[PDB]
Design an enzyme around this catalytic site. Structure first.
Site, PDB file in Angstrom:
ATOM      1  N   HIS A 108      53.629 -35.520 -39.068  1.00  0.00           N
ATOM      2  CA  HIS A 108      53.500 -36.087 -40.409  1.00  0.00           C
ATOM      3  C   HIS A 108      54.879 -36.011 -41.076  1.00  0.00           C
ATOM      4  O   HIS A 108      55.246 -34.967 -41.629  1.00  0.00           O
ATOM      5  CB  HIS A 108      52.474 -35.268 -41.183  1.00  0.00           C
ATOM      6  CG  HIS A 108      51.887 -35.980 -42.360  1.00  0.00           C
ATOM      7  ND1 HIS A 108      52.190 -35.645 -43.661  1.00  0.00           N
ATOM      8  CD2 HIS A 108      50.967 -36.970 -42.432  1.00  0.00           C
ATOM      9  CE1 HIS A 108      51.480 -36.395 -44.484  1.00  0.00           C
ATOM     10  NE2 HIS A 108      50.729 -37.207 -43.763  1.00  0.00           N
ATOM     11  N   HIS A 161      51.927 -40.372 -42.141  1.00  0.00           N
ATOM     12  CA  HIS A 161      52.509 -40.204 -43.485  1.00  0.00           C
ATOM     13  C   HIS A 161      53.209 -41.438 -44.058  1.00  0.00           C
ATOM     14  O   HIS A 161      53.368 -41.563 -45.274  1.00  0.00           O
ATOM     15  CB  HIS A 161      53.495 -39.026 -43.526  1.00  0.00           C
ATOM     16  CG  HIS A 161      54.051 -38.749 -44.893  1.00  0.00           C
ATOM     17  ND1 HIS A 161      53.260 -38.371 -45.960  1.00  0.00           N
ATOM     18  CD2 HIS A 161      55.319 -38.800 -45.367  1.00  0.00           C
ATOM     19  CE1 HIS A 161      54.017 -38.203 -47.029  1.00  0.00           C
ATOM     20  NE2 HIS A 161      55.270 -38.456 -46.698  1.00  0.00           N
ATOM     21  N   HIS A 219      52.106 -44.582 -43.674  1.00  0.00           N
ATOM     22  CA  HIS A 219      51.101 -45.542 -44.116  1.00  0.00           C
ATOM     23  C   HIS A 219      51.248 -46.981 -43.632  1.00  0.00           C
ATOM     24  O   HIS A 219      50.731 -47.902 -44.263  1.00  0.00           O
ATOM     25  CB  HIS A 219      51.033 -45.532 -45.643  1.00  0.00           C
ATOM     26  CG  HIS A 219      50.558 -44.231 -46.209  1.00  0.00           C
ATOM     27  ND1 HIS A 219      50.758 -43.873 -47.524  1.00  0.00           N
ATOM     28  CD2 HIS A 219      49.886 -43.203 -45.635  1.00  0.00           C
ATOM     29  CE1 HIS A 219      50.233 -42.680 -47.738  1.00  0.00           C
ATOM     30  NE2 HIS A 219      49.698 -42.251 -46.608  1.00  0.00           N
ATOM     31  N   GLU A 254      44.265 -36.209 -45.399  1.00  0.00           N
ATOM     32  CA  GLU A 254      45.117 -35.725 -46.485  1.00  0.00           C
ATOM     33  C   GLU A 254      44.990 -36.497 -47.817  1.00  0.00           C
ATOM     34  O   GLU A 254      45.179 -35.924 -48.883  1.00  0.00           O
ATOM     35  CB  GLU A 254      46.561 -35.772 -46.005  1.00  0.00           C
ATOM     36  CG  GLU A 254      47.588 -35.308 -46.993  1.00  0.00           C
ATOM     37  CD  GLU A 254      48.909 -36.005 -46.784  1.00  0.00           C
ATOM     38  OE1 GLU A 254      49.919 -35.539 -47.343  1.00  0.00           O
ATOM     39  OE2 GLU A 254      48.933 -37.030 -46.070  1.00  0.00           O
ATOM     40  N   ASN A 255      44.689 -37.794 -47.752  1.00  0.00           N
ATOM     41  CA  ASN A 255      44.538 -38.616 -48.957  1.00  0.00           C
ATOM     42  C   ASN A 255      43.098 -39.111 -49.132  1.00  0.00           C
ATOM     43  O   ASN A 255      42.826 -40.005 -49.950  1.00  0.00           O
ATOM     44  CB  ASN A 255      45.460 -39.840 -48.893  1.00  0.00           C
ATOM     45  CG  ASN A 255      46.920 -39.465 -48.823  1.00  0.00           C
ATOM     46  OD1 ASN A 255      47.404 -38.658 -49.627  1.00  0.00           O
ATOM     47  ND2 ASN A 255      47.643 -40.054 -47.867  1.00  0.00           N
ATOM     48  N   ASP A 290      46.021 -41.754 -41.474  1.00  0.00           N
ATOM     49  CA  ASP A 290      45.839 -41.463 -42.897  1.00  0.00           C
ATOM     50  C   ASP A 290      44.753 -42.285 -43.580  1.00  0.00           C
ATOM     51  O   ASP A 290      44.959 -43.454 -43.922  1.00  0.00           O
ATOM     52  CB  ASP A 290      47.159 -41.667 -43.652  1.00  0.00           C
ATOM     53  CG  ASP A 290      48.303 -40.854 -43.068  1.00  0.00           C
ATOM     54  OD1 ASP A 290      49.367 -40.773 -43.717  1.00  0.00           O
ATOM     55  OD2 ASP A 290      48.149 -40.300 -41.963  1.00  0.00           O
ATOM     56  N   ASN A 327      51.282 -32.879 -46.579  1.00  0.00           N
ATOM     57  CA  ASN A 327      51.873 -32.397 -47.830  1.00  0.00           C
ATOM     58  C   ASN A 327      51.001 -32.531 -49.086  1.00  0.00           C
ATOM     59  O   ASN A 327      51.319 -31.947 -50.118  1.00  0.00           O
ATOM     60  CB  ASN A 327      53.228 -33.084 -48.057  1.00  0.00           C
ATOM     61  CG  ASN A 327      53.093 -34.562 -48.377  1.00  0.00           C
ATOM     62  OD1 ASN A 327      52.937 -34.947 -49.536  1.00  0.00           O
ATOM     63  ND2 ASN A 327      53.142 -35.398 -47.346  1.00  0.00           N
ATOM     64  N   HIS A 328      49.913 -33.296 -48.997  1.00  0.00           N
ATOM     65  CA  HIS A 328      48.983 -33.490 -50.116  1.00  0.00           C
ATOM     66  C   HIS A 328      47.713 -32.674 -49.892  1.00  0.00           C
ATOM     67  O   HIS A 328      46.709 -32.863 -50.575  1.00  0.00           O
ATOM     68  CB  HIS A 328      48.599 -34.966 -50.244  1.00  0.00           C
ATOM     69  CG  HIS A 328      49.663 -35.821 -50.852  1.00  0.00           C
ATOM     70  ND1 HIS A 328      49.590 -37.198 -50.864  1.00  0.00           N
ATOM     71  CD2 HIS A 328      50.806 -35.500 -51.501  1.00  0.00           C
ATOM     72  CE1 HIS A 328      50.641 -37.687 -51.497  1.00  0.00           C
ATOM     73  NE2 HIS A 328      51.394 -36.679 -51.894  1.00  0.00           N
TER      74      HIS A 328
END
Lengths: 252, 252
Positions: B145, B170, B172, B37-38, B8, B65-66
């Protein structure tokens, strides 16, 4: 002082790893603390397991939400070096903290329980403020038993400069993030479980898989196999937090 | 082939770390995959973020999910090497898996979304069964994730012998549990985040700390600070998963 915190002792494997290895390294610490929430066959703490943990060199045992699984815990909780989450509401058996003395210095141990993704309880943040208000020691160690990493870190940061170290547990998997926050407090998201990883979170593989594949209930069964001993070393000197070191031992 | 999975990539710090460091080690791998994703300010993937990750040496970007936070992803999903969770329901934009090619060998990469403590999606277990049946490759890398470690380990065991390696994300925070399952599948609960850990899950400390103390909403703000590069190395040779190794690089 030198402190060793042992991550979640699972069932037999976890108990065996501790009893088998801790004696070989006890000489190196002044205090040994271990989470024994599931020390009894993977569910709760019982008299047998407690005695085994203590005989291997454990001075203090912490619990979790699986603390009330055995009727044998109440006796332990009232006359033994055992603690349940401070986070629990008033009128809850046992103590949420413990004061350890060693070579002229004192250490306040507090176990607190996360709230997100778990059962609703008292605000762990302010419960810690109240406790640190009326209880003082040379060093303070706070165990955060929780699911969410953000909540663990939020607690670590909220406790920075007040607690000497903040170690998370419950996630049963050791993290590679041991560090020190700005105000000097040591922190590690999860010390990890001590028991066999030849499983799924310490449970029997097929039983948990079936749980996930069918969406139906499955009798909990603890996995059996060679275990790993996971703990984190903490050095406290001069009223200051000096170092944090993740430790690992494997059952031959 | 040697594959590198970058965990991530957070906001600007994450991006900076990949941009500065990946170029220095790229030559050591045939393939590099990164969860982005982030990547965009902390929420979603935009044209700038993706282009930057590609420029540093990233061959394939995964979401989670983001994935829908920034609307620029929809155009990226139709033509670029970007994948979202296979787990999503029919009619969902973009692909849920991707086939990479190297030295004649093939790598089937698939990302899947967990369901415990998350929005409900299709059963990833049987979704993977459906995919693995129609899609074949010399190697198979599965990204899980999810929040729950039990679900990640359950997916890993259900994939044992089928997937060459299964890596979690996910959460982190890198996990120190890289190992191999009975049938030979390589595994690791969480590759961890690449960004600044001088925060909580990547958000500014105060912002998130205010979320836990007041219980009142706080817009998300990415934290700025020195970042860390967290990824995991995978060695696949002779058609069998040979080794797994967590990787770390600190930004000075």
């Amino acid at each position: 002082m030198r402190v060793l915190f042992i991550g979640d002792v699972m069932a037999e494997p976890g108990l065996r790893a501790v009893g088998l290895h801790l004696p070989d390294i006890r000489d190196r610490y002044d205090l040994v603390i271990a989470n024994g929430e599931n020390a009894a066959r993977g569910k709760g703490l019982d008299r047998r397991s407690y005695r085994l943990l203590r005989e291997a060199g454990v001075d203090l045992v912490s619990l979790g939400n699986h603390a009330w699984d055995h009727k044998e815990v109440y006796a332990l909780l009232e006359s033994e070096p055992v603690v349940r989450p401070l986070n629990y509401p008033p009128g809850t058996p046992g103590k949420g903290f413990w004061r350890l003395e060693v070579g002229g210095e004192s250490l306040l141990f507090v176990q607190v329980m996360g709230r997100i993704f778990m059962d609703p309880l008292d605000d762990p943040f302010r419960a810690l403020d109240r406790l640190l208000e009326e209880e003082k020691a040379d060093y303070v160690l706070v165990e955060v038993h929780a699911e969410a990493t953000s909540e663990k870190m939020a607690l670590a940061h909220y406790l920075d400069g007040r607690a000497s170290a903040v170690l998370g547990t419950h996630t049963h998997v050791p993290t590679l993030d041991a560090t020190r926050l700005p105000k000097g407090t040591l922190y590690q998201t999860d010390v990890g479980m001590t028991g066999t990883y030849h499983s799924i979170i310490g449970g029997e593989v097929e039983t948990f898989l079936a749980r996930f594949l069918t969406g139906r209930p499955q009798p909990f069964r603890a996995a059996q196999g060679k275990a790993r001993f996971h703990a984190t070393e903490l050095v406290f000197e001069g009223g200051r937090p000096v170092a944090i070191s993740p430790y690992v031992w494997e059952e031959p």
